[PDB]
Design a protein around this ligand. Structure first.
Ligand SMILES: CC(C)(COP(=O)(O)OP(=O)(O)OC[C@H]1O[C@@H](n2cnc3c(N)ncnc32)[C@H](O)[C@@H]1OP(=O)(O)O)[C@@H](O)C(=O)NCCC(=O)/N=C\CSCCC(=O)NC[C@H]1O[C@H](O[C@H]2[C@H](O)[C@@H](O)[C@H](N)C[C@@H]2N)[C@H](N)[C@@H](O)[C@@H]1O
Ligand SMILES: CC(C)(COP(=O)(O)OP(=O)(O)OC[C@H]1O[C@@H](n2cnc3c(N)ncnc32)[C@H](O)[C@@H]1OP(=O)(O)O)[C@@H](O)C(=O)NCCC(=O)/N=C\CSCCC(=O)NC[C@H]1O[C@H](O[C@H]2[C@H](O)[C@@H](O)[C@H](N)C[C@@H]2N)[C@H](N)[C@@H](O)[C@@H]1O
Ligand code: NI
Lengths: 147, 144
């Protein structure tokens, strides 16, 4: 059936929250709500919903980042902040089309580079990133200290 | 003494920074210095001994997602290098303390950093200075 990638607006908020809670289970209930509203008002945040037959089968969150991005040489950068496709709809090209939409958005915003990161443990994600034309740039360990 | 970088430090800062990052074109350090001095959300700090720079830290105020962190903005240690001769004397500790104060003055509740999995010494350093490991990731890039 015909699939559409829709940039998320007020009308897709429930579709998006329903999927996001499956990518990140236990990511607090009030966070998803505030995140939704922020994204709709942003010019440096956009999310994209894969729709077919009137149901939402996957999503991607994207940003335009001005912070230094690991492995990139230019600024700003279009960044893949999250991506998830429902188990039953996987390996059908949903993520490919989601990422194409993120790229289109970032390109129209004047980004020269698209970036993403994933866990060294998530081998499917690594294969996916590489199939869709991403190259590995560097691996890093992050640290934090409370101020 | 640790001072915030200004126009007069640029040349000696560039000399140390090329040692941290030999890959960087020499074009870039020039540009990067101008950018830091122009930007409110960037600052660098220089450790001096007898008026010669022997260490530096580059820092930013980060407004985008930062791996391992839960608030925004974040003070981020973008780069730190101390001359081998001046190592293990607390120079890095003092540079990072200056970075942390700048970030607190910019309302950051978290300081973050990253390093190579092979850079074992830098890992001990973050550990020693009170940082905690958050996550390890692989970064990807696609040219648009
Ligand atoms: C990976 C998916 C999305 C692929 O979907 P698909 O539709 O099945 O793919 P396709 O389009 O059909 O396939 C594309 C290509 O890949 C190939 N492929 C697909 N599947 C496989 C396969 N199983 N094996 C081999 N090859 C495969 C396929 O052949 C295709 O080849 P080609 O282009 O046609 O030539 C899918 O399998 C899936 O949903 N899997 C489960 C979830 C998952 O792993 N998702 C994405 C992979 S990244 C992991 C989750 C994620 O997005 N995390 C984001 C970040 O989360 C966290 O950070 C967040 C933070 O938590 C938030 O609060 C902030 N707001 C933002 C911040 N970024 C962490 N701190 C970061 O470190 C994380 O990076
Ligand atoms: C690590 C140093 C700086 C420590 O200096 P010191 O003065 O000697 O330390 P100290 O103050 O004496 O010691 C403090 C504690 O550490 C302990 N310590 C010190 N030395 C050792 C030791 N050798 N063994 C064990 N313990 C040690 C010491 O005991 C102390 O503990 P305590 O207080 O006594 O309990 C020193 O050894 C040194 O200069 N080493 C060589 C350089 C080095 O490794 N530097 C930094 C390590 S990672 C920190 C951040 C950093 O610089 N990152 C570079 C990033 O660079 C790149 O990214 C850049 C990009 O390239 C740029 O273009 C962008 N503009 C910004 C962007 N961030 C990569 N893409 C990123 O992935 C990289 O992460
Ligand atoms: Ni259509």
């Amino acid at each position: 059936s015909h699939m559409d990638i829709r940039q998320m607006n007020k009308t897709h908020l429930e579709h998006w929250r329903g999927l996001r809670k499956q990518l990140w289970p236990g990511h607090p209930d009030d966070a998803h709500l505030a995140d939704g509203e922020e994204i709709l008002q942003a010019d440096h945040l956009a999310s994209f919903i894969a729709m077919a037959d009137g149901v939402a089968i996957g999503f991607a969150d994207a940003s335009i980042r001005h912070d230094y991005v690991n492995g990139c040489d230019s600024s700003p950068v279009v960044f893949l902040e999250g991506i998830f496709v429902l188990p039953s709809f996987r390996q059908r090209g949903v993520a490919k089309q989601l990422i194409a939409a993120v790229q289109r958005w970032g390109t129209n915003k004047g980004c020269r580079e698209m970036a993403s990161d994933t866990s060294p443990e998530n081998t499917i994600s690594q294969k996916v990133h590489q199939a869709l034309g991403f190259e590995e740039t560097e691996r890093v360990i992050f640290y934090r200290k409370r101020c």
